[model samples]
Target: SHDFWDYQWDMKYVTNNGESYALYQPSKKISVGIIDSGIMEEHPDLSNSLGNYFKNLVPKGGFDNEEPDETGNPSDIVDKMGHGTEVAGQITANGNILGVAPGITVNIYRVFGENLSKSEWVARAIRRAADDGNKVINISAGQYLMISGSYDDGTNDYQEYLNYKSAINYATAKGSIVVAALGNDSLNIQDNQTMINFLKRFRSIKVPGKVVDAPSVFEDVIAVGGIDGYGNISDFSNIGADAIYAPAGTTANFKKYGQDKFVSQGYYLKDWLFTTTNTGWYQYVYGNSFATPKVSGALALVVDKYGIKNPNQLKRFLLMNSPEVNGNRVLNIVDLLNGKNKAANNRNSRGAVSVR
Candidate 1:
């Protein structure tokens, strides 16, 4: 009887609401690489899941005034932003709040500091995790950028795309399956026209024609979309791409009441996910950021059960077993592990897509 276990509807939705866990247990611990803000090493729920493979990629003097003081030691991968801790909790929290893969080996690669991260740093972390022999790399971060030109011509987005693509390729080549969030924006990612149209609203200048989410847009990575508690695509989740839908939790639109009005009326804590925080406590959060880890943790178990090493084969297996919900192929842990159907049997043949 974990305290917050009942609140984990995300876990229950994917695991057939707790029935799958009893049917199949992981025979061996799978190594999962989480490249995110970092982890709270001392958090009770995550301590046992985190092994010796902790690497802090954020360089010294990279922090703003609000960030925690960095010790010179590179291995001090403490969660300062709280996002990584929440993501990690969804995957490996083992105390009062059980994660999707409770006892799996978690290799924390700190790529973000103070809510900001460089694509180069993310790429480096991915390469390192693969080199370190992690079978499943969980990347809960990514961005949509111009992927055709270089910085010399004034656009650095191309270099950013290259960095992520190369790293993703390296990881896949080394037998690591990369899982990422499709993004929070409510646009169809597969349609470049839709992305460009959405970008026009914010950017005053000309939007690039070849914009796509790096790491996720790359064919090798498994992109994940967000779904709500009712198994419908979350209002904020990006879709219409090759991707898998998972329980990312949804938030009420508070804009109707204006910023100052309504205040806390827009949210209900139970509708969001419950997981570990940086302060050695638990909190509720909502986003595709949280949804990506469910796929990662489930993939770790899939690897443990089936030993599918090739990225393509693993993706196929996931797509094949996922039962469609609200026209989106949602991750079904029981069916994925059961291996009862082929790709043709599943609805919506296109597959899942990404976000951050």
Candidate 2:
């Protein structure tokens, strides 16, 4: 059995975590809401921080497709699809796999158990999280409908778009910081394998005529993209000026002991990222979906330590402090928020750079 600690590279190394825990060791009162596939609450790691659950928000017959029956009681909050379990683990797991903010109360909102949610339901979940007093709302899902226009279509007035904007604005106004993934559909070539696959699906896959995703592109939502252990952007990670970066996939270990390089529980070496699966077991998952939670957990700590009651101020604090890595501003949980960077020193100064 592979212990969770051996596999959680994103937490143990990438985010600069240490000690009995460093960045604001949070109380359950400081809640972080997860709005995605339901969380499997039976897992030992998540059982402690669990809070009240809302009715499964998945509508009947699903949004566009005939999604499965995802409606049930609080006991029904299991990850039918493992994505949400992994997302929740990244936020507050306290067992073998440590979260960025362990022991913080997690209000699990099951919004996408059936299929890709419509904007209406996602909006409802956002408002629900705010109403329930969650300080942070994490939406690790996105969609680009055929009717919805491209990435630069100068309009936010579509019904679903309006629905998203209204709820997002409402949540922010109520002081909930929203974080989302900049969907995994980047057209850029990652490598020979990715390029070969793209060529195969060039004319076969039913892609949205243009690339635009919701909740991420919505105003005030902190949209996140993905990087790998090598500090390279994932080929499938959607990129935009609005996007923030976090580590997603794993690669050959630069630091290893004997033949034990990458950590594993019961999977092959081809699988990279390790997290809780749909069942009580552990598995590997890779996407911007996982990256979004790392940011959500970081914000949970920031809000608790700084008492950032305003969304704009919170956003400014993160952007002002996140040091750039390879031209992308990635999250550094302990580096800036430790109270030492107040008025800050010139970290990258060759000859005393000015901050005016």
Candidate 3:
């Protein structure tokens, strides 16, 4: 019935100033690989969008049942946590709730179980996705590692980061544009001092060469930050010089306390993203995790529209087309497709913060 579109401010924000719906149509179907918790394979809105490739990298004997029927089959990628389903909905949901790139093929690579993932498992997922001919990879998960301190000097965690970096490079070499979350941590990723200060809050954990947020910090991946419906950066989004912003949805309380403490605010349903959940029903979710898929889905549309397949070229095109908003290059799909720069007006005034 398209009833939920009224609550999808993020979608409206990207589509021709809330006027044109034609831009949602892609010229051709492009496959996007999702590396996260598995998805609900039976979701009506997402079933047709799924590709033939599905794998569960979560090892057997785990506390959670990541397998569809707990038969130890690697291909049985069923989502236990609802995170992946939410991400999938944002990118390819075609009914009830429309995604950024509806009708696109989604390759599922389940790498998480119990809300935790090993670095190698994630890296393998990237490699497998690229090998399967996925041109765009959406990884909504990342790791914030203390790289240079005594805590990591002799540990295998640093090696894990290297393996992760190699996987990203592999994906890039195979002509895949890897898009990833910049993390929900409210810290300046590029500033080592900010990382140090943030770690200080946790009993002064020391690190050097900057605290690395995997995949996002990698040279080849497109790191994505989050913005609210008002075009303001999300309070929990990790800010960095290299990231591009997109609407990930935000809560009214986050706005009230983080952006404007004096403003009277209450929780608003419309302020959060309404997407497909693991239960075949929909739910309202928020975070940079949700923002990454928008970029991934938009990239698929860009690829189909522009016919560009090179990772470097697509990244360049995305950056050049994105309009700068509040010093952050927020993803503007309508403008990107139109090949024009339309500066996003600042909606940061206190009055711009809508309570509803």
Candidate 4:
């Protein structure tokens, strides 16, 4: 029942004292390839930080110049669903809302929208992110069903199975650590705990076993599962290896509510800091979309500390370095916090960091 801000985000908030350097480090310190809905650069936090956002599925003129494009770019990349805003908020935003990598920049690639451009479009997005030379890439949003509900090719899903597979694998080979989010299907933490017998016997619904396993299930990719503030996995969060788990934002924070509908679902309390539409120039909605940014922001912090260069090693480092999840070595916020920092001033593994 807690709010998205209370999703137990990694502490990135600070007062005007400027002593809160720990809350936000240097932006752009990490090159984050954020494939989500379009970002609103006019937003104060991202005005100076938003980077090159591209759209492979949207065609040359499809919503070019940073406008909304819902062509084949569903998976919420254009923010029409507000999921994009929440996801983006979790990554690079630095307003009242916080992201894991406030200092690092975001290069959003819109690839999955209304068409279910699973294989081809997604693949192109991954390649573009890698080729652009990103150190860490986050794929927080995924297709509702890899394909449209019609009988396309006799194959059933996507033109083939390689869209997510090839792209994820290719990106890894090209040295990019691709972090993905499992779909949000679980009910809620309370349901999981209270309805165990029913969940076990009935299983309620088909989980990872159902989705037909695409990028999120890809072995090479670091699949991120979600949890709640109590330090337990969320109810709707799809269960999996989840290389790493973080407070995925509270269950109530799962969806957005209008002004009149806000309090009924969950009120936006004083402690919240989210980037969104402005009244004339200042106002915004909030959700898990914003929560993911917290992790992305944290990813930036880890990148800074680890001096992680290649995409593969960076991904590996985040996974391997993560604290054990359900006793398994997965994404660990603690481990990430203790990672590394300071970019290489020289190419041949060079330069000494300046000390105060």
**What TM-score fits each model?**
0.88, 0.78, 0.86, 0.66
| Global lDDT scores for all candidate models | 0.77, 0.67, 0.77, 0.50
Residue 162 CA displacement from its true place in model 4, Å: 1.7
- lDDT by residue (tens digit), candidate 3, 1-356: 66677777788787654443475566445799999888998999999898988788777743234334344458868887888999999999888888888768999998766445666677888999999888999999876666666443233246667887789889988989899898777788878888766655543342444577776888778999999887888877888898899988765475556634423342445467789999998988889888889899998888877778788888888999999988999988887878763222111110111000
Tell me how far the alpha carbon of residue 269 in candidate 4 is from the true structure, in angstroms, after superposition: 5.0
* True-structure lDDT of candidate 3: 0.77
lDDT (10s digit) by residue, model 1, range 18-81: 7777766665457889999899988999887876677888776543323456543578688878
Model 1 TM-score on a 0 to 1 scale: 0.88
Worst 10 residues of 1 by lDDT: 345-354
Instruction: List runs of model 4 lying over 4 Å from the truth.
Output: 1-24, 27-29, 59-79, 112-117, 144-159, 187-211, 252-293, 324-334, 340-356
Over 4 Å off in model 3, which ranges? 17-21, 27-29, 63-72, 152-156, 200-209, 251-266, 341-356
Residue-wise lDDT of candidate 2 within 67-186, one digit each (tens)? 646443444556777778888888888877777777778888776654455567678889989989888898887654323332233432256666778898899889888998876767
Report the number of the highest-TM-score candidate: 1
Q: Rank the candidates by lDDT, best first.
A: 3, 1, 2, 4
Q: Which ten residues in a row have the lowest lDDT in candidate 4?
A: 347-356
